[PDB]
Each structure stands twice: as C-alpha cells, then as structure tokens.
Design a protein around this ligand. Structure first.
Ligand SMILES: *[C@@H]1O[C@H](CO)[C@@H](O[C@@H]2O[C@H](CO)[C@@H](O[C@@H]3O[C@H](CO)[C@@H](O)[C@H](O)[C@@H]3O)[C@H](O)[C@H]2NC(C)=O)[C@H](O[C@@H]2O[C@@H](C)[C@@H](O[C@@H]3O[C@H](CO)[C@H](O)[C@H](O)[C@H]3O[C@@H]3O[C@@H](C)[C@@H](O)[C@@H](O)[C@@H]3O)[C@@H](O)[C@@H]2O)[C@H]1NC(C)=O
Ligand SMILES: *[C@@H]1O[C@H](CO)[C@@H](O[C@@H]2O[C@H](CO)[C@@H](O[C@@H]3O[C@H](CO)[C@@H](O)[C@H](O)[C@@H]3O)[C@H](O)[C@H]2NC(C)=O)[C@H](O[C@@H]2O[C@@H](C)[C@@H](O[C@@H]3O[C@H](CO)[C@H](O)[C@H](O)[C@H]3O[C@@H]3O[C@@H](C)[C@@H](O)[C@@H](O)[C@@H]3O)[C@@H](O)[C@@H]2O)[C@H]1NC(C)=O
Ligand SMILES: *[C@@H]1O[C@H](CO)[C@@H](O[C@@H]2O[C@H](CO)[C@@H](O[C@@H]3O[C@H](CO)[C@@H](O)[C@H](O)[C@@H]3O)[C@H](O)[C@H]2NC(C)=O)[C@H](O[C@@H]2O[C@@H](C)[C@@H](O[C@@H]3O[C@H](CO)[C@H](O)[C@H](O)[C@H]3O[C@@H]3O[C@@H](C)[C@@H](O)[C@@H](O)[C@@H]3O)[C@@H](O)[C@@H]2O)[C@H]1NC(C)=O
Ligand SMILES: *[C@@H]1O[C@H](CO)[C@@H](O[C@@H]2O[C@H](CO)[C@@H](O[C@@H]3O[C@H](CO)[C@@H](O)[C@H](O)[C@@H]3O)[C@H](O)[C@H]2NC(C)=O)[C@H](O[C@@H]2O[C@@H](C)[C@@H](O[C@@H]3O[C@H](CO)[C@H](O)[C@H](O)[C@H]3O[C@@H]3O[C@@H](C)[C@@H](O)[C@@H](O)[C@@H]3O)[C@@H](O)[C@@H]2O)[C@H]1NC(C)=O
Ligand SMILES: CC(=O)N[C@@H]1[C@@H](O)[C@@H](O)[C@@H](CO)O[C@@H]1O
Ligand SMILES: CC(=O)N[C@@H]1[C@@H](O)[C@@H](O)[C@@H](CO)O[C@@H]1O
Ligand code: NA
Ligand code: NA
Ligand SMILES: [Zn+2]
Lengths: 101, 101
C-alpha cells in the first residue's frame, strides 16, 4: 500500500523545548517535537513506526532518550525526540515509516 | 587571644571551577576555593571555623552545599564553597573566625 518514509533530525538539545513532565520521577523534561506532513495524504490514519537512527550523547550523564509518537492523522503525525534530567544530547535523529492501515 | 574574622563571597557557580570528585557517588563537583591571608599572621596554625551565612539556591534541584576547610597555616587558610551534581548556586558566602590556638 502507500508506504512513505522520512527522517526527523532533532539536533542539539540546546534548541529543544522544556515540556511539562508526564512522570513525577522525571524532571527537566525536554523535547524537539515536529508535526510531519505526509507528502501524499491518506484518507485514514496510517501506521507509523519510529526508529532512532542517530544518537550523539554525552558520556558523563546517563543516556535518557525517547522517540515519542504523539498522534497520527490522515495527513501527518506528531513525534519528538525527548530527554530528561541531566542527559546531554548533541544529536538525535528519528527515521520513520508510514504504511496505509 | 588574637581573633580575626572575615567573609568569603563565592558568588554564582557559573564562575566556580570543576574539581575532581573525592566521592564516586558525587559527580559534577565544583567549587570556588580561596586562599585567605590573615591580616595579622600567627606563628602557629590558628583554629578556623566556617559558617555559611548566605545562600541562594535553585529550588528545582536538590540543595547540595559544603563549606570546605582544606588547610590552615600560620599565615592563612584555604577554604571553598563546594557543590555537585545538578545543584545551581546563585550565591554563597562563608563567614569565618580564626582564633589563636
Ligand atoms: C536541499 O535538498 C537536498 C535534497 O535534494 C537535501 O540534501 C539531502 O538531504 C538528505 C537528508 O534530508 C540526504 O539523505 C540522507 O542521507 C543520509 C546519508 O548521508 C541517510 O542516512 C538518510 O537516510 C537520508 O537518505 C541526502 O543525501 C541529501 N542529498 C543531497 C543530494 O545532498 C538538503 O539537505 C541538507 O544538505 C544535505 C547535503 C545534508 O547536509 C549534510 O549533512 C551531513 C551529515 O548528514 C553533514 O552535516 C554535511 O556537512 C551536511 O551538508 C552541508 O551542510 C548542509 C546544511 C548544506 O549546507 C550542504 O550543502 C552542506 O554540504 C542534509 O542533512 C541537509 O539538511 C536540502 N537543504 C539544503 C540547505 O541544501
Ligand atoms: C503541532 O500541531 C499542534 C496542533 O495540532 C500544536 O498544538 C496546538 O497549539 C495550539 C496553538 O497553536 C494550541 O491552541 C491554543 O491553546 C491555548 C490554550 O492552551 C489558547 O489560548 C489558544 O487560543 C490556542 O487555542 C492547542 O491547544 C495545541 N493543541 C494540542 C493538541 O497540543 C503544536 O503547537 C505546539 O505545541 C503545543 C502543545 C503548544 O506548545 C505549548 O505551549 C504551552 C503554553 O502555551 C507551553 O509552553 C507548553 O510547554 C508547550 O508545549 C510544549 O512545547 C511545544 C513546543 C511542544 O514541544 C509540545 O509537545 C510541548 O508539550 C503550542 O504553543 C506549540 O506551538 C504544533 N507544533 C509542535 C512542535 O508540536
Ligand atoms: C572597598 O572597600 C569597602 C570597605 O572599606 C568595601 O565595602 C564594605 O564591604 C564589606 C564586605 O566586604 C561590608 O561589610 C559586610 O556588610 C554586610 C551587611 O551589608 C555584613 O553581613 C557582613 O558581615 C560585612 O560586615 C561593608 O558594609 C562595606 N562597607 C562600606 C562602607 O560600603 C567594598 O566592598 C564592595 O562594596 C560594598 C559596599 C559591598 O557591595 C555591596 O554589596 C551589597 C550586598 O551585600 C550589594 O550587592 C550592593 O549592591 C553592593 O554595592 C555596590 O556594588 C559594589 C561592587 C560597589 O560598586 C559599591 O559601591 C556598590 O554600592 C561589598 O560586597 C563589595 O565588595 C570595597 N570594594 C569596592 C569595589 O568598593
Ligand atoms: C592556593 O594555594 C595553593 C598552594 O598552597 C595552590 O595549589 C598549588 O598550586 C601549584 C600551582 O601554582 C601546584 O604546583 C604545581 O603542580 C604541578 C603538578 O600538579 C607542577 O607541574 C608545577 O610545576 C607546580 O609545582 C601545587 O601542586 C598546588 N598545591 C596544592 C597543595 O594543591 C592553589 O592553586 C590552585 O589549586 C591547585 C590545586 C591547582 O589547581 C588544580 O590544577 C589542576 C591541573 O593543574 C586541575 O585543573 C585541578 O582541577 C585544579 O584544582 C582544582 O581547581 C582549583 C582552581 C581549586 O579549586 C582546587 O582546590 C581544585 O582542586 C592550581 O593550578 C590552582 O591555581 C591556590 N589557589 C586556590 C584557589 O586554591
Ligand atoms: C528526577 C529525574 O529525572 N530523575 C532521573 C530518573 O528519572 C532516571 O532517569 C534516573 C536514571 O537515569 O536518573 C535520575 O534519577
Ligand atoms: C552522581 C551524583 O552526584 N549524585 C547525587 C548524589 O551524590 C546525592 O547528592 C543525591 C541527593 O541529592 O543526588 C544525586 O543522586
Ligand atoms: Na560514561
Ligand atoms: Na523545590
Ligand atoms: Zn541526578
């Protein structure tokens, strides 16, 4: 079926946004969220899978990363690179595939 | 006996030095160390007591502070304001007294 793919480059976390934490055991929650628009819209939300295909993380603090999928519409999806506490992310990229349901 | 007093103002931790940690359970150890010279030297090392008399610390991370006394000579002493991990110190001051032994 209609299969589409792309890659989100989140870059250095200095440019990421503070976001409220959804977990009281995590603080300093930060993310680079993007609304991705499909090159060809679907009529119904496709299945999207995310894959972390680049990481550059500081060794002196724990590695803490999430590739978050927030929502999928027929025309796009919202995803983020997400970290917390004292992790330092110098780069992170998320490869993705969408497949008609 | 000859009693002397003063106050060390360490200021904002952005200007503090990274120092090697003396405790594997502490990282990001940082300090503002000063070599204090007594206005009137002693012939023997006096007793020095340190007191933390100013603190301005960020509430979003734990408060972690030490007023460290490293050494005392007849002519002075070495002390520091010391913090670690993700504590943010905006100001810290150490009042001190020296008393002939
Ligand atoms: C203008 O449009 C072109 C496409 O027509 C685009 O270039 C293409 O970018 C793709 C990523 O979106 C890249 O595909 C990837 O390649 C990876 C392997 O290299 C794979 O793992 C991925 O799966 C994916 O397939 C294409 O190869 C690339 N095509 C061509 C013909 O270049 C432009 O994107 C921007 O420029 C790209 C060259 C690339 O930048 C380079 O990234 C590398 C490391 O990834 C490195 O940082 C380079 O220094 C950097 O290029 C330099 O800096 C950029 C900003 C520009 O000034 C370049 O001319 C420099 O050489 C990509 O990441 C960039 O977004 C796109 N935009 C611009 C401004 O040209
Ligand atoms: C991707 O697209 C979505 C919509 O589909 C968009 O989110 C929507 O943003 C609307 C503003 O454009 C917002 O409506 C407003 O809501 C106000 C009350 O909250 C009203 O007064 C206004 O009249 C207006 O109606 C929608 O509620 C919102 N919808 C949803 C479902 O979220 C994205 O916009 C970006 O993310 C939004 C959540 C929001 O960011 C948040 O802003 C608040 C304070 O306003 C705060 O700073 C939050 O911390 C911030 O969210 C976090 O940071 C952003 C940058 C992302 O990383 C979020 O995931 C984090 O939680 C909005 O201002 C942002 O532009 C849009 N873009 C992205 C990158 O997701
Ligand atoms: C030049 O020498 C004078 C002394 O002759 C010195 O001023 C004295 O500083 C003492 C601290 O070393 C201070 O004693 C303390 O007072 C505290 C209560 O206020 C007590 O808790 C302490 O126990 C201790 O006793 C004296 O009061 C003070 N004396 C006088 C006559 O001023 C200069 O030090 C520098 O200036 C001081 C005025 C002071 O700076 C001020 O600090 C306060 C908050 O503490 C605040 O930040 C003010 O804005 C700041 O003053 C302003 O900025 C400074 C940098 C100068 O530009 C001042 O003219 C401004 O008003 C002290 O901390 C400073 O180091 C000393 N050096 C200079 C450059 O004048
Ligand atoms: C207060 O006075 C003491 C001396 O009584 C002084 O410490 C001495 O500094 C000497 C350099 O001036 C050093 O001698 C050198 O040692 C080298 C080998 O290590 C030789 O190649 C040289 O030929 C020369 O002999 C002495 O070993 C040293 N003595 C002691 C007992 O410490 C203070 O200087 C400051 O602190 C020193 C410890 C040192 O700082 C350290 O430098 C190393 C790499 O050189 C590294 O960056 C450390 O992280 C750093 O120490 C930390 O940061 C400093 C700023 C303080 O916060 C320390 O407590 C931390 O551990 C020296 O370079 C510094 O100027 C002097 N001043 C202060 C503020 O304490
Ligand atoms: C407060 C906060 O974010 N705490 C984090 C916790 O969530 C977890 O990531 C842990 C191990 O890496 O490191 C810290 O304790
Ligand atoms: C690695 C490191 O510095 N860890 C610190 C630990 O030393 C202690 O201060 C604790 C409670 O505040 O917070 C962190 O876990
Ligand atoms: Na490590
Ligand atoms: Na608090
Ligand atoms: Zn921690």
């Amino acid at each position: 079926q209609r299969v589409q793919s792309g890659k989100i480059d989140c870059g250095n976390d200095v440019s990421w946004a503070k976001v409220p934490s959804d977990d009281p055991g995590r603080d300093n929650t930060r993310e680079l969220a993007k609304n991705i628009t499909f090159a060809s819209p679907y009529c119904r939300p496709p299945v999207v899978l995310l894959s972390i295909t680049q990481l550059d993380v500081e060794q002196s603090q724990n590695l803490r990363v999430i590739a978050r999928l927030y929502s999928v519409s027929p025309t796009g999806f919202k995803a983020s690179c997400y970290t917390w506490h004292n992790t330092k992310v110098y780069s992170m990229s998320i490869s993705w595939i969408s497949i008609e349901n």
